[PDB]
């Protein structure tokens, strides 16, 4: 009787300790969330930012595209004409 | 003759618009050169902060380790606790 309450107040100590040591680390935990949540968001801003630069970037590579293929097609009309004006 | 008017003409005007074409085409890759440093930046960046998240990852899992430990010490009192009152209720 006396060994039994002995060993279980000792048994519910360290229960006690060990509920408080996980409420420590369960709040640790919460701050490396915190922090884990906050660079995760950073990532994400700057990620909006690059798919902007990545828009503006293929927009512009589009268009230069266009313009060059107006141009090759404005120089066979070139070539054509000299080539009509070289006969005379 | 006027044919050959008609077609100097033409290629006179043919010639203006390449030049235009031209000009539009350095002003266009201009702008294609910063927008493509701009990118290179942000890729860098990103780079960057990928590397900085997955050290806060690994602070995080460390401390669920941690966590980890101690439930299972936990459990195992829990166990001893159910025994040790069963043998007390008895007495």
């Known amino acids: ?5 002995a060993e279980l107040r000792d048994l519910e100590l360290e229960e006690a300790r060990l509920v408080q040591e ?4 369960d709040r640790n ?6 922090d884990l949540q906050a660079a995760q ?3 994400a801003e700057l990620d ?10 293929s927009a512009l590579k589009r268009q230069q ?3 060059l293929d107006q141009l090759g097609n404005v120089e066979n009309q070139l070539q054509y004409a000299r080539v009509q004006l070289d006969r005379l």
């Open 1 to 5: 009787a006396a060994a039994l309450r």
């Open 48 to 57: 909006q930012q690059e798919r902007q630069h990545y828009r503006d970037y």
């Open 29 to 34: 935990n919460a701050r490396a969330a915190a």
């Open 65 to 67: 595209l266009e313009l």
């Open 41 to 43: 968001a950073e990532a």
């Open 22 to 25: 996980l409420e420590d680390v």
